[PDB]
Design a protein around this nucleic acid. Sequence first.
RNA 1: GGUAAGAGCACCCGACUGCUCUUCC
RNA 2: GGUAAGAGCACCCGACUGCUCUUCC
Lengths: 89, 86, 86, 84
Amino acid sequence: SNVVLIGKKPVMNYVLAALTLLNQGVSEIVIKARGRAISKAVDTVEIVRNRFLPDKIEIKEIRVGSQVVTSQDGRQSRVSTIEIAIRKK
Amino acid sequence: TPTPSNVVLIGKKPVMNYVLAALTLLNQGVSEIVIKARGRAISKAVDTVEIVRNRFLPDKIEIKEIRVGSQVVSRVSTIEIAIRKK
Amino acid sequence: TPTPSNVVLIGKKPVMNYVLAALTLLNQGVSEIVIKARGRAISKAVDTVEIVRNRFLPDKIEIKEIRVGSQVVSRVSTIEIAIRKK
Amino acid sequence: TPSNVVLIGKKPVMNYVLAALTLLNQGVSEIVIKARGRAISKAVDTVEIVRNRFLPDKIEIKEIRVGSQVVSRVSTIEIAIRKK
RNA sequence: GGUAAGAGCACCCGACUGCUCUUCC
RNA sequence: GGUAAGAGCACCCGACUGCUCUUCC
């Protein structure tokens, strides 16, 4: 799987996961997140770009969207989503 | 009629504020607007865009482009989502 | 598709702070940065750029793009100067 | 100095706005606003006031050039604007 | 989660007041 | 006698933003 799913863990967890994927020869990886984690996704990309691969990375695609989920009180709600496909240059 | 800025800066306010700003711009003959945000508010930015497109102007608005970045403060993430009617 | 940005924001601190930030970014491998400012600091933004291109990296840094604008406050002017390695 | 040039100094921005608009209203199609040092922001102000408040959808930013001059060093800006 | 009320730090736009310097009637 | 327009410095106030925090629902 070339997908890094952003969650509640510190951003460095996902940064290191992504870096590990890139170092293992995986040409293209996809960082995915929804709701509050969206900014963390962006962080994950930027750190990967700005701390470890200052030139060896490019953003292939950014896609945003929405999905309906049932909250912890059984109420249907819309949640934003983001996917960032990046690859080595 | 003076030309308003086509930029909606997402900040600390509720999403509805920015949805209303964006829709006000679009309804006043502005063809393309840019939603900008930094840090956690990036989520709000996305919310705003989605809320503007799928809910209140359906089938009329295109996401022209999405640009992410970093701003030196330490650093913080940035996003700019350019959308337009189509 | 747009290449992610790296922004240095200008304020009222001594110009060398911002020059330092810019040079640091450029030396780390970032090939293009954006110097942003609002109001009076616009002058300093220009300063930063010039100081970057004339004192440290002569014949290495070029101006990619200059954009001026306005933000509602009343109103304040804005500048963005994108510079790039030749 | 060319006749289509507005040089920014220490005067309130309204003066330079008025000079620019006077030129544009007298039939001059393109004008250039020039400034140096701290007045640079004022130059931008002038331009922004002219194209957004006085003549909406009629003025284009043709070109912006920044530079340096020796006095110490001072920054310079030139902003060429034109009618659509 | 909240058009619930506040707080600290950083960053930054603008203003008042005092002082210094420049340019007048 | 008048005290304007700028450039600095000090202090402070009012917004915007970023990052945390407290209480309340």
